[model samples]
Target chain A: VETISFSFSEFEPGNDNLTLQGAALITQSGVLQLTKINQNGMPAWDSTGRTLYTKPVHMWDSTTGTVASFETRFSFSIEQPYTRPLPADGLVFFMGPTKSKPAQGYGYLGVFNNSKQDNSYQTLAVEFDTFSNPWDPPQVPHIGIDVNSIRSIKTQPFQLDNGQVANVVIKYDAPSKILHVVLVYPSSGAIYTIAEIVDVKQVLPDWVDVGLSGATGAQRDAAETHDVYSWSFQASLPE
Target chain B: VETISFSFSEFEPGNDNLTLQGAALITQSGVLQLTKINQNGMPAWDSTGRTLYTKPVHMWDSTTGTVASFETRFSFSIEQPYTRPLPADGLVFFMGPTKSKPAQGYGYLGVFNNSKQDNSYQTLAVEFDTFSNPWDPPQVPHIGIDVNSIRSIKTQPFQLDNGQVANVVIKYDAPSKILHVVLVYPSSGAIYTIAEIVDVKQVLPDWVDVGLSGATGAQRDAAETHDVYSWSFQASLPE
Candidate 1:
């Protein structure tokens, strides 16, 4: 298993372990604070979000032109807001090419750009959705699997108290193209799972950039902190 | 005299010590990293920058809609880059209205939104400009004090070693409406100053928001890390 782990216990600025881009900040206590209030005037939404992640890991198999199976587990939290105003956007755990920064909008989740015809884009993300988009079924907190779009292939309800961190585990099977997610509430050990298969073939990128991204919109005027207390990603092919 | 000081030696997130908006991140060692590499595609300039400062301090005379004189001292560094390309833009120390966020693009310092007819908008900013704008007086690094528009009333040549922190002291006299700036280079103690005076009344708003904002452009692809070590601000009537 090829493994990589991250903990904000201390952030060594030039340390090559992880790269922090955009609004990502490591706090004194190691909290990865992402996004900020929308200081922008209008259309009213400002893309104030940050992303943290490792360099692309070697998971491509040239022989089959497909990526091998992998697993990742991490924890994060979205702090409560200054106002009762609901938070606009949310976070995403993704695997794409290196240095990938998507669109500039809250609803876009900072993974896809303004263009709706983005089918050919190369990215796969597990969205820790807190607010629903106008195109979505309804406004609700959810954990969804998105392929190059905010639209989810499959989604499960997700809600938690403010100021609390939640743990997540994702295991992918290459042979079956099944991607499984298990979310555990550290506060109560409550568990939620999505038994679904997200075919990797749909995402054409062979090599991938793995990381975390989160945001808040203009009207939402909220803030979210993506604190990765400890995270580990391991990759291996099926025996 | 009331004074406030901030050292990013450790930024307590959401500390409320100062209003932080956008992509500013405080490093473990007190480097306030602002902006990022142009992860944007094209036309592609992403106005990604952060602003930090105290709530609108008592800097204006509620009487006659005028303003009080003040002095501020700050130290910051713009670290080295990715490509030999020109640094995408630069930083701005500004005083505007409460919760001020301006335009997006090269040269805006991530503070002002895109608009040239900003005279009636109300605000003043001292730009530590680094990029060469398409319409500027030849593209080169310089220091300029902007009234409401990106257009600088007065400008001076500005240069310093990359990856080095520089100290600056800015003092303004309310009566004379003269704002002076003094800069010192630690490595050489080579100081630069602008006998230039920025007329405060020219900026419409009486009371204003005060902070720093920095940004990078798409083509410039030039990335800069602005680390603010410490800063202090005080206000009083001119002697």
Candidate 2:
């Protein structure tokens, strides 16, 4: 049985289990919105804006430098503004040694250190690239497992439309050092194993800061709104 | 300095200091879900309806006509169904002289004079009403500030989506007897001051119940789920 597990349906007040940086909202819509349109009704964080929703409790042992196996499940939805040349950057699910935001924003997804490939912060992430970047593989929307950069180890290409919601489940077996990932439509449909059997412990430190990060760019003429429907983390394989 | 301040990353494990009513859920998504669907996956408020998130703190002085300055900041979002005749009832941010819910649910938004139109339970509220009641002026979606009745003291027309998010900051000045309200767009651009400079002391008691009240109406044929991102009440004027 899993131990020390908790779940949330929306933005919680700042505390041990949850904290927010930049622009995340606990919406009346019963969802956590990480990005919103600014005054001119455009994304404010230009090329370097980031929003972070994190778990502050020490899940990783910094002192002991030991690791633990854990499982995380979360649901997300992205609403685009007008369509066409305008779309959001996408979303990132991350676990890192430190709770930090990327100075580069958007594609960096708050986890990757864009400062000259600085590996000062050890982290692992799953990126949902909606607005394919210049470096995006095949240059389109896809989901990939990332270690330190946007260069995905493995990726599954898919297109997500406005108003559609999807759920993702990621599990890590500390012993096997392998991380598994799954994606599915909200109620029922098909399942997509976007990334699988990746040895995450090979790159990340034990007891990491788990969080969700996202960004929007200026070149996009439309708007991108990201919502978190539900998210949870449970300690697996009791320490 | 304030000695009784606290934070909750998730709906602070139910305690006397904080609790709930109706069908609200401290969701696995880390949000306060005010409405849930039935097995049919439709809105279910029959056996369960109404949810109130209130602080146990006494914010006002009873016997005195003078008041202390207070500022409240929070973020919320509402989900609506496919439009037609059916839609969401909306949201309410309230401060009442008593810790109570309205005798009725649905369009009342959980706080109103339905309990015999009694003024004893003096209250003030900001309603993000998505569904317009027959009594609503002009008939359409809007934001209103209500006192004792759903009939608003002030109203502004605005339409928000099911997954949309908004931030609100409300402040009250004891010396000037003014209350300020500002809604930021996250990235900056505009402001929505739905209410201001109203003499609440003229109608409300100093101390009262402060929290969020939300309702989903069956007559509307749609569901409404409300969530609180973050809430803080700063004591501007000390006791």
**lDDT, model 1, position B118:** 73
Q: What is the C-alpha lDDT of each candidate?
A: 0.64, 0.61
RMSD to true structure for each model, in Å:
24.4, 22.4
- Per model, how much of the real contact set is kept? 0.00, 0.00
Off by over 4 Å in 2: A1-239, B1-6, B9-16, B39-42, B45-65, B115-118, B185-190, B236-239
Clashes of each: 13, 26
Shift in Å, residue A35, candidate 1: 2.1
Interface RMSD of 1: 29.1
Q: Give the best candidate by lDDT.
A: 1
Reference-based lDDT, residue B127, model 2: 76
Candidate 1: tens digits of C-alpha lDDT, residues B2-34? 333344434554556766666676645555556
